[PDB]
């Protein structure tokens, strides 16, 4: 990577599946070396060894390198020292969790455990941020009330909460997007939506303008236009 960035002076990309194996490999060697474990088995030279790597993928005036890293985690504990210190050296993250895979919604990136420094009101527009803001709020209310919902019905719940929830369930299912490289697996032909298109589709859907048609119309389809087509399909 360094040779492309520098010598040929071209921008690069990097993929790793999985870079957890890198921290794991250290911990194995560490014991025998004469070093003693830092906490829960892992090498005490963990912080330094992560650090050096993530500064050597860095962005200069000679090339800038966009990276995609897949971190493996045992039983999804993220309070552990190895997943945790990587998140600081990442400007944006897309935490992928088991629940959203059980919901039958691939992709499985959690929407409520996502962060970005790339999402601002002038980095991608004021408008882009306000459409994303509203998605974030809606699902966080819907989660707040999962307890209450289960304990008692929605007729014993508030009418106001029920709008947020009804919006939120539809918005969760809408997040889905079958893939054209796992067309087989998904069971549905792949779809793609542009960045510009994506905001628009979510903007409308939030204001109630396309909440009134099935929650399965939003399951496993891409942008807004695919949902309207799937409704026709459903209707027959």
């Amino acid at each position: 990577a360094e040779y492309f960035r520098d010598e040929e002076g071209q921008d690069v990309l990097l993929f790793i599946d999985n870079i957890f194996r890198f921290t794991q490999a250290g911990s194995e060697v560490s014991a025998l070396l004469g070093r003693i474990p830092s906490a829960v088995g892992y090498q005490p030279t963990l912080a330094t060894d992560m650090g050096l790597l993530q500064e050597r993928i860095t962005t200069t005036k000679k090339g800038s390198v966009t990276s995609v890293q897949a971190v493996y985690v045992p039983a999804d504990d993220l309070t552990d020292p190895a997943p945790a210190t990587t998140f600081a050296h990442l400007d944006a993250t897309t935490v992928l969790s088991r629940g959203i895979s059980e919901l039958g919604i691939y992709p499985a990136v959690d929407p409520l455990d996502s962060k970005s420094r790339l999402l601002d009101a002038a980095v991608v527009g004021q408008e882009h941020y306000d459409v994303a803001s509203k998605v974030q709020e809606t699902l966080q209310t819907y989660k707040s009330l999962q307890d209450i919902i289960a304990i008692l019905g929605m007729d014993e719940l508030s009418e106001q909460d029920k709008l947020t929830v009804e919006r939120a369930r539809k918005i969760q299912r809408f997040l889905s997007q079958p893939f054209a490289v796992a067309e087989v697996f998904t069971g549905i032909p792949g779809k793609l939506v542009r960045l510009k298109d994506t905001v628009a589709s979510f903007k409308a859907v939030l204001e109630g303008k396309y909440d009134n048609i099935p929650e399965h119309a939003f399951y496993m389809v891409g942008g807004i236009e695919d949902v309207v087509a799937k409704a026709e399909k459903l209707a027959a």
Binding site: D77, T79, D147, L152, G153, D155, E156
Partner: protein
């Protein structure tokens, strides 16, 4: 974390039990006033019913439905509604008077 997120949510469920507990004790008090009142009402009614049999019970429609303004009454609100709506099929433009929020 994990620990604390179990622990706070558990408090929610515990507070909810206390509120549902208290409310159910109180329900038991109201049901007795509700029954006493019902007896006297039903008995007044019975005297016109003697009449109505002997008269022969015989024959837009109106719909009336009966609820409290308070909620938490389980599926009374909507089951009763569901029977209002079923008979909303026998005339769409029927005038419904709703007794209770």
């Amino acid at each position: 974390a994990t620990l604390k997120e179990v622990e706070m949510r558990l408090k929610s469920i515990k507070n909810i039990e206390k509120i549902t507990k208290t409310m159910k004790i109180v329900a038991s008090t109201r049901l007795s006033k509700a029954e006493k009142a019902k007896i006297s009402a039903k008995k007044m009614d019975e005297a016109e019913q003697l009449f109505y049999k002997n008269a022969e019970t015989k024959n837009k429609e109106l719909i009336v439905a009966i609820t409290s303004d308070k909620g938490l009454c389980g599926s009374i609100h909507s089951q009763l509604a569901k029977a209002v709506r079923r008979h909303l099929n026998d005339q769409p433009n029927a005038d419904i008077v709703t007794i209770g929020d």
